[PDB]
């Protein structure tokens, strides 16, 4: 104290895996039916590029309320499910809401295509995910909360993005 601390916010539809990713990150356990309504906060002490960081993570479940957690958010995971086209299309809305709240033309965010383990149920291709990330000028990562693919990496990379914005 003063210590490096980051308020990270996980946003997205609609059963995309916001809770599963968060709980995998914090506890290394995969939750299969986590109450979809529950919005809660978690903390993890990490070492990223050899530098200590406390990550405070809001697992979200539009108006003043959401505007406020967007206002204080230092970085955002924009999550969709690769098996849910609707959730993919919703990403546009989230990014626009965040930039409106921030009154900025860019802000630390990463696009996450979750449920990549369900390779024969995909409604969104990896190429389509990469194209969306290009349009939004953000980093894209595919993940799976179920097999714990790119879970730590997604959160670490968001911190890297925040740090690069502060360089
Ligand atoms: N197969 C698979 N299922 C997932 C994955 N992530 C979440 N789920 C499942 O999808 C459902 C919704 O996940 P959840 O984390 O509650 O979604 P949220 O509403 O965005 O918080 C649950 O049944 C989870 O087990 C994943 O990477 N792969
Ligand atoms: Mg949830």
Swiss-Prot record:
Top enzyme category: hydrolase
Tissue-specific expression: Ubiquitously present in all tissues examined, with the highest levels in heart, placenta, and skeletal muscle. Moderate levels in lung and liver; low levels in brain, kidney, and pancreas.
Motif segment (Effector region): 34-42
Keywords per UniProt: Acetylation, Cell membrane, Disease variant, Golgi apparatus, GTP-binding, Hydrolase, Lipoprotein, Membrane, Methylation, Nucleotide-binding, Palmitate, Phosphoprotein, Prenylation, Proto-oncogene
Catalyzed reactions per annotation: GTP + H2O = GDP + phosphate + H(+)
Broad class of where this protein is predominantly found: membrane
Clinical note on disease: Ovarian cancer: The term ovarian cancer defines malignancies originating from ovarian tissue. Although many histologic types of ovarian tumors have been described, epithelial ovarian carcinoma is the most common form. Ovarian cancers are often asymptomatic and the recognized signs and symptoms, even of late-stage disease, are vague. Consequently, most patients are diagnosed with advanced disease. Noonan syndrome 12: A form of Noonan syndrome, a disease characterized by short stature, facial dysmorphic features such as hypertelorism, a downward eyeslant and low-set posteriorly rotated ears, and a high incidence of congenital heart defects and hypertrophic cardiomyopathy. Other features can include a short neck with webbing or redundancy of skin, deafness, motor delay, variable intellectual deficits, multiple skeletal defects, cryptorchidism, and bleeding diathesis.
Protein name per the record: Ras-related protein R-Ras2
Native source species: Homo sapiens (Human)
Lineage: Eukaryota, Metazoa, Chordata, Craniata, Vertebrata
């Amino acid at each position: 104290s003063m210590q490096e601390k980051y308020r990270l916010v996980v946003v997205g539809g609609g059963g995309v895996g916001k809770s599963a990713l968060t709980i995998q990150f914090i506890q290394s356990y995969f939750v299969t039916d986590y109450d979809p309504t529950i919005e809660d906060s978690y903390t993890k002490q990490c070492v990223i590029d050899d530098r200590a960081a406390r990550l405070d993570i809001l697992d979200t479940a539009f108006g003043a309320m959401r505007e406020q957690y967007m206002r204080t958010g230092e970085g955002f995971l924009l999550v969709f499910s690769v098996t849910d086209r609707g959730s993919f299309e919703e990403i546009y809305k989230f990014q626009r809401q965040i930039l409106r709240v921030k009154d900025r033309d860019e802000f630390p965010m990463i696009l996450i295509g979750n449920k990549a383990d369900l390779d024969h149920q995909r409604q969104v291709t990896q190429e389509e995910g990469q194209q969306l990330a290009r349009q939004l000028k953000v980093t894209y990562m595919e993940a799976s909360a179920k097999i714990r693919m790119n879970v730590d990496q997604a959160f670490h990379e968001l911190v890297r993005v925040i740090r690069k914005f502060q360089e």
